[PDB]
Amino acid sequence: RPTFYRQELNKTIWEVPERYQNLSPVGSGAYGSVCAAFDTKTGLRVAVKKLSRPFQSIIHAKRTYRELRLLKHMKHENVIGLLDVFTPARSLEEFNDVYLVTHLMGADLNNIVKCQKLTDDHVQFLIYQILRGLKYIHSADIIHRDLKPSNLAVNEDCELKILDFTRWYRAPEIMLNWMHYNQTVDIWSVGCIMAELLTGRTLFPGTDHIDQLKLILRLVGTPGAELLKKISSESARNYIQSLTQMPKMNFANVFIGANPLAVDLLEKMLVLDSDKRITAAQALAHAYFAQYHDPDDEPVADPYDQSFESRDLLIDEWKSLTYDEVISFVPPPL
């Protein structure tokens, strides 16, 4: 076992191995506190996240287990992965805190889009990396569900990683509460992200769920006959069909000046009918990315056992299962 040292950083206390030095808080939220640190063993700057109230309830306990299982499974250049996971606890009884460690990512796409106006070549590279990580994630039967600029970490090399796998980036089927949305919800988010990088403006800055939908339908037009035929909720259908019908706009006109290849990709990404959205694997082959697309270098993920998501367990079982995952963690080769 390693040796730990203790310090209070912004109200929260931190107990971590000596190997992690010069802890410096980077931001907080409902997820937990994150500190930047220097890792003496590897020589790398790392981010250390302390989970907040990881076993407060069954929801929190399952969530803590899900995140650890999820992060332990991601080994991909464009997805946040685990360098280390630890707890100061020596036994299961005293297990109450979980610490996650990954390569420090200095910025996100919000501090890059609002602070600049991306050139078409930088858009190609950034979006290509997103789709490359999304192919890997989707190959594991995982849906991100919450893709947005602040969930895409970027460093100075413009290397990008997905993390955390009104919402201006949410697919309309979710705005409408369709219970069977598929992985193409993530593609819709990518489309909204790409559009923002090209124009510097939020594509759909809705103020609520209703306003969000009107903004979407203003651009992509109201659902056609084939799409309405797939809506079971009578309420949702009645609403939709009762709106002042609107036509699909010419994307080449909305995104005037942009690269015609980028516009064609947006049209295939921002399709209302989810059965017809381009998939991540298909987008990677789109001509827009011809400069970066390497089919032998866009790998898929090993199988991911999600059977736990339907289990109804007590807090101590979720806690014990999490402890099992901390103890059994094997770091990645240096």
Ligand X SMILES: CN1CCN(c2cc(-c3ccncc3)c(-c3ccccc3)nn2)CC1
Ligand Y SMILES: Fc1ccc(-c2n[nH]cc2-c2ccncc2)cc1
Burial class of residue 284 in the structure, from the number of CB atoms within 10 Å of its CB (0-12 exposed, 13-18 middle, 19+ buried): buried
Does the footprint of ligand Y cover residue 173 (CB under 6 A)? yes
Residue 211 known to be catalytic: no
**Contact letters (x/-) for ligand X, 34-73, by CB under 6 A?**
x------------xxx------------------------
Query: What does 227 interact with, of ligand X, ligand Y, none (CB < 5 to 8 A by kind)?
Result: ligand Y
- Of the residues 120, 164, 211, 273, which one makes contact with ligand Y according to CB under 6 A: 273
Contact range with ligand Y by CB under 6 A, out of 69-77, 123-131, 171-179, 258-266: 171-179
Query: What does 153 interact with, of ligand X, ligand Y, none (CB < 5 to 8 A by kind)?
Result: ligand X
Query: What does 223 interact with, of ligand Y, ligand X, none (CB < 5 to 8 A by kind)?
Result: ligand Y
The Cα 15–Cα 309 span in angstroms is: 30
Q: Minimum Å distance from CB 227 to ligand X?
A: 31
Q: Give all strands (DSSP E) within the chain, no chain letters.
A: 4-9, 12-17, 20-27, 32-39, 44-51, 84-86, 99-103, 107-108, 152-154, 160-162
Q: CA torsion 125→127→133→135, rounded to 10°?
A: -120
User: 121, 146, 157, 164: which one is catalytic?
Assistant: 164
Using CB under 6 A as the binding rule, the residues of this chain from 32 to 71 that contact ligand Y are none
Using CB under 6 A as the binding rule, the residues of this chain from 230 to 249 that contact ligand Y are 230-231, 233, 236, 240
* Residues forming a β-bridge with 7: 14
Which residue shows structure tokens 């069954």? 58
Binding residues for ATP: 26-34, 49
